[PDB]
Amino acid sequence: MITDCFEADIAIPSGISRPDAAALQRCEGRVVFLPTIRRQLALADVAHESFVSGGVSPDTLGLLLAYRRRFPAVITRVLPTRIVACPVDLGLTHAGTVNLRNTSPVDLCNGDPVSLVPPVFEGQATDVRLESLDLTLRFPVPLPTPLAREIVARLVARGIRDLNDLNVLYYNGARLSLVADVQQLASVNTELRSLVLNMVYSITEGTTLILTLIPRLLALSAQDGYVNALLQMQSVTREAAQLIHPEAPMLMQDGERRLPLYEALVAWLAHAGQLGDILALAPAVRVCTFDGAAVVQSGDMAPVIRYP
Amino acid sequence: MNAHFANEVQYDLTRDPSSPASLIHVIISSECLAAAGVPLSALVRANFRVETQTRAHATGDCTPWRSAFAAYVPADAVGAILAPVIPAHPDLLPRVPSAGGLFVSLPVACDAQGVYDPYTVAALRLAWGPWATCARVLLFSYDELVPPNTRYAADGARLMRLCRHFCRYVARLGAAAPAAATEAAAHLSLGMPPISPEEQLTAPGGDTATAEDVSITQENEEILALVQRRSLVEWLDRGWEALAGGDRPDWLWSRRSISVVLRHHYGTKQRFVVVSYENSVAWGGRRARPPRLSSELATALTEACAAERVVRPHQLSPAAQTALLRRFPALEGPLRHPRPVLQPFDIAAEVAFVARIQIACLRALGHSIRAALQGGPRIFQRLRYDFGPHQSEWLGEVTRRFPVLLENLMRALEGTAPDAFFHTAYALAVLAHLGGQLVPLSDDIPARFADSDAHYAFDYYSTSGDTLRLTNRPIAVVIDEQSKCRFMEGPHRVCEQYLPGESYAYLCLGFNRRLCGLVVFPGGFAFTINTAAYLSLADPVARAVGLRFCRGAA
């Protein structure tokens, strides 16, 4: 119960109005960013006034950047005197199953990892405010990982337009758009530096062999409908072959003992497939409904089994 | 094989480009190395390191030594190129056995409109160990190295044997053969005698313009005619990949054309095979960067005195001498230099550079030897030893035996080969002394030899019978009137357990960084000699000698 559960206890103060206190009874399946793993904390360390720096509360793209400096935890039960949350990383429960709540507009599936994202969507940024205490609780949004990478991708691309539309998405035929918002340039700089260092290190000498195969793909996309759909209608490589004639050098330095493409894959995987984990946080949570259904709708709870 | 691949990767740094250069893949034979003073067994004990530098025609400085790659094969070298052997299946390609040696591609100094100066020298070095006795240096001329024309002609018939050998080898292996191999056999047979590498050496053929060789045929075959009125290579490339399990790029060029040009080594009279692959970026390769090597300098220099029936360009009239100068501004150096450090437009001129230095060093002794010994002296002893009553009778023999040795030293010192002389303790003191006015090569000098004038170097000589040099490695001893002595920090030489002049049957000779000589006879009786006074050399010679025999310090 130290290893199985871990009851990190957020204390509730004395003076809270009964309309504000009963507003916390609808805060069941949430995500609370614990700074440490103390067994006794306060709402001020949980609320957004803990998140704010000196004079500056950052934007949504920066609001990711101190989630991953903290410990996400899910509220287990809202008592009148305290709020109990088990941290995700240490131990889930006795049996190891906690319930979240879809504050998403998006329906989940079983077995898919669930990433939690700041409130970026339109008509969605709902922060339960304590009027009796002047505290806001910016509850993040649990999302599917095929969305939660694109939503980070639209925000990072929006900041780099602003250094010289984009905020519209789709998911299973549901049109949805996120909040267009001005971004602090200090937040964009650590993001853009995190792109390039994972992009420069992802290039190896054997990748020039792969580059030669680009006109073979357009020779292949004229016959395979799978390749014709794979590239895109607006892909770069379809445009990067009509102006580009790639070639490989003849010999390799010590090219007898080393593998050109096998070294190309491992350096690619360690930096380019790894790159989505560095932008967002890791989806350490998936949903395994035991007996309910295969699709978990919005507003409903969902059972959670930890995710390696 | 791989030694040429690895070097071309180095030549891909285009070097600078500001000074244009080229590269020539060379296969030295073993018998050319054997005659070069190279023990063959020592190399066998998979690349090998070699230092190279280029040396100017007449006057100038040599390139600083640079490390290249070498791989020695104690087998047929040309055969390994020609008939690569699958590790799993040896019997796939039968071939004629031959000899071989290391593979080194060599740099070639080019120009804008690249033309090599013949008689200019490129140099190797071979280190079997730290000390200079384990180091040899071989020389080559751009005339020697660069053949006028290549041959891809004789290599053509070779490939059809492969298409026959694969088709023949699979037919034996039959059912056991992997299906992909049997497949390629079908096509390769539709495209359709052991392999002897020495054919391509003696083959009378090479590449040609062949333009009029097409038009010769159409005015031939119409004569005649009017009287009347997936390549195979990819299957071969898939032939190995069936029986190999890997691409093995070393083999891929072996399946292509291979240009084998037989050459001869002016030094050893022996043979070394220049090779240029088909895809090779170096000289002779079908893929090469312009400008390429031209004979413009060389061809004229032959007919300049040939049309004059003259042996030497300096016996050529200065009118024709200036004639080629107008075309070729680089020939000023050898022709117009008043006192060329090297005899211009010669071959052995470089050797004359060495041998005169040999003489220059000797007289720096005999005149200095005569100096201190001139009027009959009393040497006493600069060392410390105790003598027994019976040992005195021995010392009595040292008196009578004393003058004969002093002859025999300078006898042998003169008699030494000029090459090997430069490994001796005295030649190292010179290369150390002139350097003092760097690190002499082979690191023969101890690190503290530059500390005090007390640090010395030594050789030993047999007192009885033939007088010889008993010490490969010059021995370093520090001295401190009498003062004791001690060795320095570090196969076995029994001569090294003794101090100089400590025992009978050792003549102990030494020098200094200051180059103040010391001659130590048995019994410890020894006198100083300062040979720096009588040593006389030109600074342009001294600086040119060092850059060959020493290295820029680390």
Short mmCIF file of C-alpha atoms in Angstrom, two decimals, chain A:
data_model
loop_
_atom_site.label_atom_id
_atom_site.label_comp_id
_atom_site.label_asym_id
_atom_site.label_seq_id
_atom_site.Cartn_x
_atom_site.Cartn_y
_atom_site.Cartn_z
CA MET A 1 0.00 0.00 0.00
CA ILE A 2 3.21 1.98 -0.02
CA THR A 3 4.21 -0.02 -3.11
CA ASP A 4 0.69 -1.08 -4.13
CA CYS A 5 -1.17 2.19 -3.64
CA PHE A 6 0.35 5.46 -2.64
CA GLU A 7 -2.07 7.78 -0.88
CA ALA A 8 -0.76 11.26 -1.61
CA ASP A 9 -3.26 13.35 0.32
CA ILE A 10 -4.19 16.80 -0.93
CA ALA A 11 -5.65 18.60 2.07
CA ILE A 12 -8.72 20.80 1.70
CA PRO A 13 -8.77 24.06 3.71
CA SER A 14 -11.44 25.19 6.17
CA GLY A 15 -13.10 28.05 4.31
CA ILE A 16 -14.76 26.78 1.14
CA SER A 17 -18.36 27.58 0.24
CA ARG A 18 -20.72 24.64 -0.16
CA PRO A 19 -21.34 25.54 -3.83
CA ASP A 20 -17.57 25.47 -4.29
CA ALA A 21 -17.06 22.38 -2.15
CA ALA A 22 -19.76 20.43 -4.00
CA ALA A 23 -18.12 21.53 -7.24
CA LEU A 24 -15.20 19.26 -6.33
CA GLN A 25 -17.44 16.21 -6.08
CA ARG A 26 -17.51 16.22 -9.88
CA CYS A 27 -13.70 16.06 -10.00
CA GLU A 28 -13.50 12.28 -9.81
CA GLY A 29 -11.41 11.08 -12.73
CA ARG A 30 -8.85 13.82 -13.16
CA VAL A 31 -5.11 14.38 -13.56
CA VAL A 32 -3.16 16.25 -10.89
CA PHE A 33 0.46 17.23 -11.49
CA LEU A 34 2.19 16.56 -8.21
CA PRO A 35 5.56 18.30 -7.94
CA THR A 36 6.89 15.72 -5.46
CA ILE A 37 5.57 12.54 -3.85
CA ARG A 38 4.87 13.97 -0.43
CA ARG A 39 2.12 12.30 1.56
CA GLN A 40 0.62 15.67 2.61
CA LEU A 41 0.12 18.49 0.11
CA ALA A 42 -2.11 21.52 -0.36
CA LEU A 43 -4.32 22.76 -3.20
CA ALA A 44 -2.00 25.73 -3.75
CA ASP A 45 0.75 23.31 -4.78
CA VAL A 46 -1.73 21.60 -7.10
CA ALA A 47 -3.50 24.62 -8.57
CA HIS A 48 -2.30 26.80 -11.42
CA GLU A 49 -0.70 29.29 -9.03
CA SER A 50 1.91 26.63 -8.40
CA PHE A 51 2.42 26.35 -12.14
CA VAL A 52 3.03 30.07 -12.67
CA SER A 53 6.59 31.43 -12.75
CA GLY A 54 7.67 34.91 -11.72
CA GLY A 55 5.10 37.15 -13.37
CA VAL A 56 4.60 34.74 -16.28
CA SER A 57 2.09 31.95 -16.66
CA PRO A 58 3.07 30.23 -19.93
CA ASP A 59 0.98 29.35 -22.95
CA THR A 60 -0.43 25.91 -23.78
CA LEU A 61 2.69 24.91 -25.72
CA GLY A 62 4.72 25.82 -22.65
CA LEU A 63 2.14 24.21 -20.36
CA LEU A 64 3.48 20.83 -21.51
CA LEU A 65 6.98 21.77 -20.53
CA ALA A 66 6.51 21.53 -16.76
CA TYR A 67 4.08 18.63 -16.79
CA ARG A 68 7.06 16.41 -17.56
CA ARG A 69 8.96 18.02 -14.70
CA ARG A 70 6.20 16.79 -12.39
CA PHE A 71 4.30 13.66 -11.37
CA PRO A 72 0.84 13.09 -12.87
CA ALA A 73 -1.65 11.51 -10.48
CA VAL A 74 -5.34 10.65 -10.66
CA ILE A 75 -7.86 11.62 -7.99
CA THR A 76 -9.25 8.50 -6.33
CA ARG A 77 -11.93 9.91 -4.03
CA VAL A 78 -13.00 13.41 -3.00
CA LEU A 79 -13.56 13.43 0.73
CA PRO A 80 -14.87 16.59 2.43
CA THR A 81 -11.54 17.16 4.20
CA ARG A 82 -9.05 15.85 1.64
CA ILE A 83 -8.46 14.64 -1.91
CA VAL A 84 -6.52 11.41 -2.41
CA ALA A 85 -4.52 10.70 -5.56
CA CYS A 86 -2.25 7.78 -6.34
CA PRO A 87 0.78 8.70 -8.48
CA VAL A 88 0.91 6.96 -11.83
CA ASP A 89 4.58 6.00 -11.72
CA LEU A 90 4.84 4.37 -8.29
CA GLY A 91 1.81 2.15 -7.94
CA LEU A 92 -1.72 2.30 -9.16
CA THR A 93 -3.97 0.70 -6.51
CA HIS A 94 -4.24 -2.57 -4.57
CA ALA A 95 -5.24 -4.38 -7.77
CA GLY A 96 -3.55 -1.83 -10.01
CA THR A 97 -6.58 -0.33 -11.77
CA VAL A 98 -7.68 3.30 -11.49
CA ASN A 99 -10.51 5.09 -13.31
CA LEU A 100 -10.05 8.21 -15.42
CA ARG A 101 -12.76 10.33 -17.02
CA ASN A 102 -13.02 11.43 -20.63
CA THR A 103 -12.89 15.18 -20.65
CA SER A 104 -12.06 14.66 -24.32
CA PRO A 105 -14.51 15.25 -27.14
CA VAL A 106 -12.98 12.05 -28.46
CA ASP A 107 -14.05 8.46 -27.88
CA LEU A 108 -11.38 5.99 -26.81
CA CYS A 109 -10.73 2.34 -27.66
CA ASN A 110 -9.44 -0.59 -25.64
CA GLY A 111 -5.70 -1.12 -25.44
CA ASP A 112 -4.73 2.21 -26.94
CA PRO A 113 -2.22 4.24 -24.91
CA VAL A 114 -3.65 7.48 -23.56
CA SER A 115 -1.69 10.73 -23.56
CA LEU A 116 -2.82 13.68 -21.50
CA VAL A 117 -2.74 17.10 -23.16
CA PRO A 118 -3.44 20.66 -21.89
CA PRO A 119 -6.87 22.12 -22.75
CA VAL A 120 -6.15 23.17 -26.32
CA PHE A 121 -9.53 22.51 -27.96
CA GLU A 122 -12.21 25.11 -28.68
CA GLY A 123 -15.15 25.23 -26.30
CA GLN A 124 -13.14 22.96 -24.03
CA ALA A 125 -10.83 25.02 -21.76
CA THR A 126 -12.90 24.41 -18.64
CA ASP A 127 -10.97 25.16 -15.46
CA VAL A 128 -12.86 24.47 -12.24
CA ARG A 129 -12.32 27.71 -10.32
CA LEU A 130 -12.48 27.98 -6.54
CA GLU A 131 -14.33 31.22 -5.92
CA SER A 132 -13.95 30.77 -2.16
CA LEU A 133 -10.16 30.51 -2.50
CA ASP A 134 -9.22 32.17 -5.85
CA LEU A 135 -7.67 29.01 -7.31
CA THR A 136 -8.01 27.49 -10.77
CA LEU A 137 -7.49 23.85 -11.68
CA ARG A 138 -6.39 23.42 -15.28
CA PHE A 139 -7.46 19.83 -15.82
CA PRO A 140 -5.67 18.27 -18.80
CA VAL A 141 -7.39 16.24 -21.48
CA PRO A 142 -6.75 12.49 -21.89
CA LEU A 143 -6.44 11.80 -25.63
CA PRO A 144 -5.59 9.00 -28.06
CA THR A 145 -1.96 8.95 -29.14
CA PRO A 146 -2.77 9.18 -32.91
CA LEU A 147 -4.28 12.56 -32.03
CA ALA A 148 -1.92 13.65 -29.27
CA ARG A 149 1.11 13.64 -31.55
CA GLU A 150 -0.66 15.67 -34.25
CA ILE A 151 -1.98 18.21 -31.75
CA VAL A 152 1.55 18.86 -30.53
CA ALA A 153 2.60 18.94 -34.18
CA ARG A 154 0.11 21.68 -35.07
CA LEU A 155 1.29 23.82 -32.16
CA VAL A 156 5.00 23.47 -32.92
CA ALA A 157 4.36 24.29 -36.57
CA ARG A 158 2.32 27.35 -35.57
CA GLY A 159 5.21 28.90 -33.66
CA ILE A 160 7.57 28.58 -36.61
CA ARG A 161 5.14 30.31 -38.96
CA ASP A 162 5.52 33.10 -36.40
CA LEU A 163 9.29 33.31 -36.98
CA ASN A 164 9.16 34.34 -40.64
CA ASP A 165 -5.50 26.87 -41.76
CA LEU A 166 -3.22 24.97 -39.39
CA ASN A 167 -5.45 24.60 -36.32
CA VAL A 168 -8.10 22.28 -37.82
CA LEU A 169 -8.15 18.51 -37.26
CA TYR A 170 -10.15 15.40 -38.11
CA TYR A 171 -10.52 12.08 -36.30
CA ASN A 172 -12.78 9.22 -37.46
CA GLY A 173 -14.87 11.59 -39.56
CA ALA A 174 -15.33 14.09 -36.72
CA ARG A 175 -14.22 17.59 -37.64
CA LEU A 176 -12.70 19.44 -34.70
CA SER A 177 -10.51 22.50 -34.25
CA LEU A 178 -8.24 23.69 -31.46
CA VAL A 179 -7.78 27.16 -30.01
CA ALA A 180 -5.73 29.47 -32.19
CA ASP A 181 -3.42 31.19 -29.73
CA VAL A 182 -0.36 33.42 -29.68
CA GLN A 183 2.72 31.63 -28.40
CA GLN A 184 5.59 32.85 -26.26
CA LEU A 185 8.81 32.68 -28.26
CA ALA A 186 10.79 31.40 -25.26
CA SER A 187 8.69 28.23 -25.33
CA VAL A 188 9.21 27.74 -29.07
CA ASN A 189 13.01 27.92 -28.79
CA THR A 190 13.35 24.81 -26.64
CA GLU A 191 10.95 23.01 -28.98
CA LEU A 192 12.80 23.97 -32.16
CA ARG A 193 16.12 23.04 -30.58
CA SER A 194 14.59 19.70 -29.60
CA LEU A 195 13.57 19.07 -33.22
CA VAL A 196 16.91 19.78 -34.88
CA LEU A 197 19.17 17.90 -32.45
CA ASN A 198 16.97 14.85 -32.99
CA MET A 199 17.00 15.58 -36.73
CA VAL A 200 20.72 16.19 -37.25
CA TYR A 201 21.69 13.15 -35.15
CA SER A 202 19.18 11.07 -37.14
CA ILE A 203 21.30 11.39 -40.31
CA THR A 204 24.01 8.82 -41.04
CA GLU A 205 26.21 8.01 -44.06
CA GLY A 206 24.15 4.94 -44.94
CA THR A 207 21.04 7.09 -45.34
CA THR A 208 22.44 8.30 -48.67
CA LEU A 209 21.78 4.78 -49.99
CA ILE A 210 18.11 5.22 -49.06
CA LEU A 211 18.07 8.64 -50.77
CA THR A 212 18.94 7.02 -54.13
CA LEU A 213 15.70 5.00 -53.96
CA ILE A 214 13.40 8.05 -54.30
CA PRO A 215 12.79 7.77 -58.09
CA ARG A 216 12.13 4.06 -57.56
CA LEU A 217 9.23 5.02 -55.28
CA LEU A 218 7.59 7.22 -57.90
CA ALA A 219 8.28 4.39 -60.31
CA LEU A 220 6.42 2.21 -57.79
CA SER A 221 3.62 4.64 -56.85
CA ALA A 222 2.38 4.52 -60.45
CA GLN A 223 1.47 0.84 -60.02
CA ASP A 224 0.89 0.06 -56.33
CA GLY A 225 -2.15 1.85 -55.00
CA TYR A 226 -0.71 1.16 -51.54
CA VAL A 227 2.38 3.24 -52.34
CA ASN A 228 0.26 5.79 -54.24
CA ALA A 229 -1.74 6.31 -51.05
CA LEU A 230 1.28 6.06 -48.74
CA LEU A 231 3.37 9.03 -49.91
CA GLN A 232 0.66 11.71 -49.99
CA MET A 233 -1.04 14.01 -52.43
CA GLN A 234 1.02 16.79 -50.80
CA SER A 235 4.17 14.88 -49.89
CA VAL A 236 7.67 16.35 -50.10
CA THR A 237 9.35 13.32 -51.71
CA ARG A 238 6.93 13.44 -54.64
CA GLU A 239 8.16 17.00 -55.18
CA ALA A 240 11.70 16.10 -54.05
CA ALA A 241 12.38 13.87 -57.05
CA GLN A 242 11.51 16.20 -59.92
CA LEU A 243 14.23 18.67 -58.86
CA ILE A 244 16.52 16.16 -57.13
CA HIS A 245 18.65 13.47 -58.75
CA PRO A 246 20.25 11.60 -55.82
CA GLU A 247 23.36 9.44 -55.95
CA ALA A 248 25.66 7.48 -53.67
CA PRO A 249 29.46 7.57 -53.40
CA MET A 250 31.32 4.56 -54.71
CA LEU A 251 33.32 3.36 -51.69
CA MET A 252 32.95 3.58 -47.93
CA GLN A 253 35.57 4.25 -45.28
CA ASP A 254 36.29 0.80 -43.76
CA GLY A 255 33.27 -0.49 -45.66
CA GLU A 256 34.14 -4.15 -45.09
CA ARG A 257 33.39 -4.47 -41.36
CA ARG A 258 30.48 -2.05 -40.88
CA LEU A 259 26.87 -2.16 -42.02
CA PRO A 260 25.63 0.93 -43.88
CA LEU A 261 21.86 0.50 -43.59
CA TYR A 262 21.80 -1.25 -40.22
CA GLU A 263 23.59 1.73 -38.72
CA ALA A 264 21.14 3.97 -40.58
CA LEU A 265 18.10 2.39 -38.93
CA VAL A 266 19.32 2.40 -35.33
CA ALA A 267 20.34 6.05 -35.45
CA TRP A 268 17.00 6.82 -37.07
CA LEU A 269 14.96 4.95 -34.44
CA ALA A 270 16.87 6.47 -31.54
CA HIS A 271 16.12 10.03 -32.69
CA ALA A 272 13.21 10.22 -35.12
CA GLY A 273 10.75 7.67 -33.74
CA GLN A 274 11.90 8.79 -30.28
CA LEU A 275 11.07 12.41 -31.16
CA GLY A 276 7.35 12.31 -30.36
CA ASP A 277 8.14 11.17 -26.82
CA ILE A 278 10.34 14.24 -26.34
CA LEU A 279 7.77 16.80 -27.53
CA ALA A 280 4.85 15.51 -25.46
CA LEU A 281 5.02 13.32 -22.38
CA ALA A 282 4.94 9.55 -22.45
CA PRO A 283 1.58 7.74 -22.67
CA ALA A 284 2.04 5.67 -19.52
CA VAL A 285 -1.67 4.72 -19.46
CA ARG A 286 -3.88 2.53 -21.62
CA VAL A 287 -7.49 1.47 -21.23
CA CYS A 288 -8.53 -2.15 -20.69
CA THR A 289 -12.26 -2.26 -20.06
CA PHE A 290 -12.77 -5.68 -18.54
CA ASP A 291 -16.43 -6.22 -19.34
CA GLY A 292 -17.85 -2.91 -20.56
CA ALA A 293 -17.28 -2.42 -24.28
CA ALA A 294 -14.69 -1.78 -26.97
CA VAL A 295 -15.26 1.99 -27.30
CA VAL A 296 -15.26 4.35 -24.32
CA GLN A 297 -17.28 7.48 -25.04
CA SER A 298 -16.80 11.01 -23.78
CA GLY A 299 -17.73 11.96 -20.22
CA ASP A 300 -17.60 8.34 -19.04
CA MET A 301 -14.99 6.68 -16.88
CA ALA A 302 -12.55 4.11 -18.18
CA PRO A 303 -10.47 1.45 -16.40
CA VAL A 304 -6.72 1.94 -16.62
CA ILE A 305 -3.95 -0.64 -16.75
CA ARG A 306 -0.35 0.65 -16.68
CA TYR A 307 1.60 0.75 -19.89
CA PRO A 308 5.26 -0.14 -20.47
#
